[PDB]
Amino acid sequence: EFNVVPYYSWFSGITQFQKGKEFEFVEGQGVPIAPGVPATEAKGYWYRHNRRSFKTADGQLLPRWYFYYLGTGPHAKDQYGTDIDGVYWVASNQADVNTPADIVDRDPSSDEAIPTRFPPGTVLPQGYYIEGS
Ligand SMILES: Nc1ncnc2c1ncn2[C@@H]1O[C@H](COP(=O)(O)O)[C@@H](O)[C@H]1O
């Protein structure tokens, strides 16, 4: 949850459930599927939301990552592929990463998030759960 309204991702998040496993994709992979989007526009980044829990007298949420098309979201101005903590860049090999994706953001009610799905052959990062799946 957010005490500051986030930029809305077109897609459901990917949640870490095993500590220690790194968030990664093979180069050319990792852009979630949206109907009608040309592969030339399949470029962007996953952004890590660190989550924080409140203290109890019991006994820790792990991060959840959200996808943003290139030139959108909280890192809209950062260059593709730049080392930034909490940003993981992904792109189809059809995409030119020197230009922002031609994709207006999501919301209001207008559209709900698309459950995150990847094409056959995608190496899925172990230790992460794709929300919606
Ligand atoms: N920065 C964000 N933080 C939390 N939720 C977001 C964010 N951007 C968009 N959303 C939408 O809120 C829902 C949470 O994602 P998920 O719970 O993993 O299914 C998703 O449908 C998101 O796309």
What type of residue is 56? T
The answer, yes or no, to whether the previous bond of 125 is cis (omega within 30 of 0) is no
Contacts with 77 (C-beta within 8 Å, 6 or more apart), sequence order: none
In the numeric block, which tokens belong to residue 79? 């260059």
Which residues lie across from 16 on neighbouring strands?
Answer: 128
| Ligand 1 mean position, distance from CA 121 (Å) | 25
Q: How was this structure determined?
A: X-ray
> Which ligand 1 atom is nearest residue 130's CA?
18
| Ligand 1 mean position, distance from CA 104 (Å) | 16
Parallel, antiparallel, or unpaired: how do β-strands 43-49 and 128-130 relate?
A: unpaired
Residue 33 CA, chain-centre distance (Å), reads 12
The resolution in angstroms reads 1.7
- Return d(Cα 127, Cα 41) in angstroms, integer: 28
Query: Is 131's C-beta closer than 6 angstroms to any atom of ligand 1?
Result: yes
Contact assessment for residue 68 and residue 45, using Cβ atoms and an 8 Å cutoff: yes
In the numeric block, which tokens belong to residue 84? 């930034």
97-112 burial string, b = 16+ CB within 10 Å, else e? beebbebeebeeeeee
Closest C-alpha residue for ligand 1 atom 14: 12
